Amino acid sequence: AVAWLVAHVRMLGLDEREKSLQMIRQLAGPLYSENTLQFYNERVVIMNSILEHMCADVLQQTATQIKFPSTGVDTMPYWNLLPPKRPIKEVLTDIFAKVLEKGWVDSRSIHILDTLLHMGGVY
Amino acid sequence: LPVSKSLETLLDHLGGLYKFHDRPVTYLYNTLHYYEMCLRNRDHLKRKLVHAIIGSLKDNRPQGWCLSDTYLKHAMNAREDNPWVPEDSYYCKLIGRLVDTMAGKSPGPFPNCDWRFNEFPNPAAHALHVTCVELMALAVPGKDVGNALLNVVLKSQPLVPRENITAWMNAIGLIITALPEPYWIVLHDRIVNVISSSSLTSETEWVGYPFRLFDFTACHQSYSEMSCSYTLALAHAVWHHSSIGQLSLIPKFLTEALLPVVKTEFQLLYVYHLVGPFLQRFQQERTRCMIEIGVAFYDMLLNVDQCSTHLNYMDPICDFLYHMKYMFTGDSVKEQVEKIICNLKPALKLRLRFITH
Amino acid sequence: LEGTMNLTGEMQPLVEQLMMVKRMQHIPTPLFVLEIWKACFVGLIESPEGTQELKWTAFTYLKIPQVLVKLKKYFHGEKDFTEDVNCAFEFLLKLTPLLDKADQRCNCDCTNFLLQECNKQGL
């Protein structure tokens, strides 16, 4: 799944025929029909689903909505959280003008700072 | 009272006539103002009259009042037992009903029929009669209702948020200002008994630095959320929204209660942060109490100067008093302060030398 | 930053940085310890939502080996963390509503804080 998410992010995939197979692969449909003794038919499956959902996040954004393979309590908390069509000079507008008053570094905003740093340029 | 039993059943007969107009807020405010010190005789019978005064509220059909349904559920059986367990959460929800009248679904189920008589030039009167009658049947109101209401901020609850804390303070100030005298009389005791004397003086702390601690909005971070700053912010909000006539109690309050409860200097700084900004509100029309508050500040200054080792945080105090005399009073407190300033220390004397003009 | 971005690297890089910022600033041991404890407690409250709190608690209980190594190395023979740590705890225990909200977040952190305090009795 990871290797071919990597392959899809490189190829065009305009037909999106690979996504129809990736969704079936990540699908939790088979409830261990074959008597495959594993002792963790649910736990290992949930682990595999939440592990696959950790990757293939940026990819599913470059295409149709995600098939929701994880099915967990809460998704990944840390992400881009960057507006679709907005200039990068938003630190002065929202982030820094707030941290100048909100003087505890706003632990949620530090990820925004790192993302802006490695998305723009140190200069 | 005893003829009060005459209309206890009369309200059951002509209770339908009140389907036209309804102003029981003033009818109750004019009743619990100064009678509350002896209102127990009326409240032991209000144990029954809660179902009589509720005749005006029951003689309607808007189907927009929501928490009134919970109040009915708790007051239609065991009139002294049901609303008493979830008191904190009940007060939190009751004042949330008003604080959400600015951002949430405000023009929804509450206002209707026909938006020009919907009691929405001001919606605060909705949660006044409830607070009154819900406990008027008991001997509790007067001291415990207002204190428990104030106790929703400093005694934080999972149902109270942390973002619009200033909006919630505004809601508290708007609810409390309209209740009669005994309800909002809590603020004075809540200040004196606890805040100025919790320990705050001997155990002062390495916290010592006053100016960052007293002023609110220091609770921008989760830090600096000291319980004394909460009371200062709440007193600010209350004195602000109530800045019409209930401010006439502050001069007697200061010159009678605050004198033998102050020995150190940051207590004087707390009194300053309490009664500083409202000096202009006083000077607007209440030009009398200005000189009383001024001489009270001078007397507290003398009281701390006579009992202190070193006066370190007094440098801003000097210019504070300077501008307070310069832009508020003028030369009216001069005859009263000439014989008061002289008993100070040589440092404070050299500082305030220019007051003699 | 040292808590959110990274978790490893504890030889003494954070110790060196804390020392360096301690030299060129107001450096009372009480204020320094209150600052580290306030940054330790402001996390785990507003930052995490799901599985991040399980890392925030591990960071709060990795912080005390750091301050222990700091006490062993940085300070020597001048208020050897007997008086200043107590003064900072009193400097911290004064702010009750912060600790109240901290216990309210975990919903069981009152006794957990009681144990973490006697856990810090290693120093």
UniProtKB/Swiss-Prot annotation, chain A:
It comes from Mus musculus. Component of the Mediator complex, which is composed of MED1, MED4, MED6, MED7, MED8, MED9, MED10, MED11, MED12, MED13, MED13L, MED14, MED15, MED16, MED17, MED18, MED19, MED20, MED21, MED22, MED23, MED24, MED25, MED26, MED27, MED29, MED30, MED31, CCNC, CDK8 and CDC2L6/CDK11. The MED12, MED13, CCNC and CDK8 subunits form a distinct module termed the CDK8 module. Mediator containing the CDK8 module is less active than Mediator lacking this module in supporting transcriptional activation. Transmembrane segments: none annotated. Belongs to the Mediator complex subunit 24 family. The chain holds residues 618 to 740 of 987 of the full protein. The lineage of its organism: Eukaryota, Metazoa, Chordata, Craniata, Vertebrata. This is Mediator of RNA polymerase II transcription subunit 24. It is found in: Nucleus. Component of the Mediator complex, a coactivator involved in the regulated transcription of nearly all RNA polymerase II-dependent genes. Mediator functions as a bridge to convey information from gene-specific regulatory proteins to the basal RNA polymerase II transcription machinery. Mediator is recruited to promoters by direct interactions with regulatory proteins and serves as a scaffold for the assembly of a functional preinitiation complex with RNA polymerase II and the general transcription factors. Required for basal and activator-dependent transcription. Expressed in the adrenal gland, brain, epididymis, heart, kidney, liver, ovary, pancreas, prostate, skeletal muscle, small intestine, spleen, stomach, testis and thymus.
UniProtKB/Swiss-Prot annotation, chain B:
The keyword Oxidoreductase does not apply. It is found in: Nucleus. Its main location: nucleus. One of its GO terms (cellular component) is nucleoplasm. It comes from the Eukaryota. Keywords: Activator, Nucleus, Transcription, Transcription regulation. GO terms for biological process: positive regulation of gene expression; positive regulation of T cell extravasation; positive regulation of transcription elongation by RNA polymerase II; positive regulation of transcription initiation by RNA polymerase II; regulation of DNA-templated transcription; RNA polymerase II preinitiation complex assembly. Belongs to the Mediator complex subunit 23 family. Component of the Mediator complex, a coactivator involved in the regulated transcription of nearly all RNA polymerase II-dependent genes. Mediator functions as a bridge to convey information from gene-specific regulatory proteins to the basal RNA polymerase II transcription machinery. Mediator is recruited to promoters by direct interactions with regulatory proteins and serves as a scaffold for the assembly of a functional pre-initiation complex with RNA polymerase II and the general transcription factors. Component of the Mediator complex, which is composed of MED1, MED4, MED6, MED7, MED8, MED9, MED10, MED11, MED12, MED13, MED13L, MED14, MED15, MED16, MED17, MED18, MED19, MED20, MED21, MED22, MED23, MED24, MED25, MED26, MED27, MED29, MED30, MED31, CCNC, CDK8 and CDC2L6/CDK11. The MED12, MED13, CCNC and CDK8 subunits form a distinct module termed the CDK8 module. Mediator containing the CDK8 module is less active than Mediator lacking this module in supporting transcriptional activation. This is Mediator of RNA polymerase II transcription subunit 23. The chain holds residues 978 to 1334 of 1367 of the full protein.
